[PDB]
Ligand binder design. Structure first.
Ligand SMILES: Nc1ncnc2c1ncn2[C@@H]1O[C@H](COP(=O)(O)OP(=O)(O)NP(=O)(O)O)[C@@H](O)[C@H]1O
Ligand SMILES: Nc1ncnc2c1ncn2[C@@H]1O[C@H](COP(=O)(O)OP(=O)(O)NP(=O)(O)O)[C@@H](O)[C@H]1O
Ligand SMILES: [Mg+2]
Ligand SMILES: [Mg+2]
Ligand SMILES: [Zn+2]
Lengths: 255, 260
């Protein structure tokens, strides 16, 4: 079994690209933000890069971000930018190459649901004058980068409902097929009733989620770090609340 | 103020295209489904059309759907399909789907479509926009689509959201977009509302209704008078299968109101 924390992401310093994925709503951003805050604590510098056509990076930190990286207020180490990339993904590849030439030690990508993620992958494995070679080559490289387990992983985020877990299975399975490494699941928005507190809803709710949780661990227990974030009463926004939240990523919540 | 229900949608018999929109996860499918079930009850027939590259329609009903319409098991009136339409042609394709579909005999279509980003881009498209005979035959069918989106007898959007910051904010943006494009919208469905049980004192439960209520209050203060603001409660189990989805949909048309 495996420590239910992202300590390993912190420890694996070769990591250059960390992708965060999951169904809509599960808390992809909240996590990306959290994760980068934690990494930024033990790296030379960290870039938080969001591709949502709209961007919730700024909304997350109540600070205007842009296609121009900048320092996240309250950190001197963390930066964030918000951009907009059979060929809606050539442009996407270029960003990476260019961005990979920047001096940020680690990059945490926040991205539009597997739809476009999964579509990018679909790409290398589909393509199969020197401006033909030259492009492809450039994918070749990127692609190797993705499959290089020292350089790239995926973090899966989900909640304990049917559709979310299902998609998490498919995703884990795709990444495998593509040979992209993944070894972390973040199960978010867990309702932990308060102890000695009897609530029908509260109880029954934990009852149903727990039936998912159980399954998640029985299945990924041994080759995934399965973190478990609690559902908070307020949204997780602003430097403060995100930092607190993020601690739970690294050292397990257990009430 | 306006009745907190989707009765008007049922009563608005010219409606041909009903789009269900909102942030990821808010319950767009669960609503689309619910809504269609209700309409199907008071229309000749109703098509439930999902474009999510996701197969969430089948998941919703535990039944295999596809690019070929079929009867939803347990109804004799309701059908569903699941298809896959710069990002030009594709918006171009999206229009072909709309046109193709529109010429079938289904009295009403409820579109389950993706987060704001994905329909929008397309909407943004018209204004901005022996073979050439097709180049043309295209602009033409885009004219017709865009015409129809703009005819309020024919099209409306339903906005789904939950009572958290990002969701409401997007709902605002959408309502505002639809206005700019002159597409009609007059229903908000506020989903996953925690109503604590009466007499039940719970820290979490209480506090949580506290924070949501501060959103709701705002939602009504703002859209109260020109939107039907429905309020679906958060249920303990996922809403799946014909049965559960039916019960849920009832609340779309009769306001849920459990003692405060
Ligand atoms: N565990 C939690 N407890 C309380 N609030 C949370 C939790 N996780 C996320 N949130 C809040 O719930 C909403 C969704 O989180 P968010 O990270 O935006 O999900 P997401 O996957 O980024 N959404 P999307 O970009 O549409 O796929 C935001 O308001 C968050 O601040
Ligand atoms: N009011 C509710 N009570 C209980 N469960 C709900 C409620 N609304 C939605 N759900 C469950 O929430 C999950 C997601 O709802 P769904 O209709 O899939 O959201 P969505 O907006 O379509 N997600 P996406 O298409 O990825 O943006 C499903 O498990 C539903 O059963
Ligand atoms: Mg996000
Ligand atoms: Mg859906
Ligand atoms: Zn409770």
């Amino acid at each position: 079994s495996m420590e239910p924390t992202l300590q390993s992401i912190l420890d694996q310093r070769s990591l250059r690209w960390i992708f965060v994925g999951g169904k809509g709503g599960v808390g992809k951003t909240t996590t990306s933000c959290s994760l980068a805050i934690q990494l930024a604590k033990v790296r030379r510098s960290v870039l938080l890069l969001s591709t949502d056509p709209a961007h919730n990076l700024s909304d997350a930190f109540s600070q205007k971000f842009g296609k121009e990286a900048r320092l996240v207020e309250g950190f001197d180490n963390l930066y964030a930018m918000e951009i907009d990339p059979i060929d809606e993904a050539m442009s996407f590849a270029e960003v990476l190459k260019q961005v990979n030439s920047l001096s940020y030690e680690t990059i945490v990508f926040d991205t539009a649901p597997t739809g476009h993620t999964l579509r990018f992958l679909q790409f290398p494995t589909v393509l199969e004058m020197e401006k033909l070679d030259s492009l492809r080559v450039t994918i070749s490289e990127v692609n190797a980068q993705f499959k290089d387990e020292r350089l790239t992983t995926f973090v899966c985020v989900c909640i304990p409902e049917f559709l979310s877990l299902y998609e998490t299975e498919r995703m884990i399975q795709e990444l495998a097929n593509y040979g992209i490494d993944t070894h972390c699941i973040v199960v978010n928005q867990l309702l932990f009733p308060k102890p000695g507190s009897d609530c029908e809803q509260c109880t029954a709710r934990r009852r149903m989620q727990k039936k998912y949780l159980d399954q998640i661990e029985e299945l990924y227990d041994e080759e995934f770090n399965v973190v478990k974030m609690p559902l908070l009463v307020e949204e997780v926004r602003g430097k403060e609340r995100l930092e607190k939240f993020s601690e739970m990523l690294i050292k397990p919540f257990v009430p």
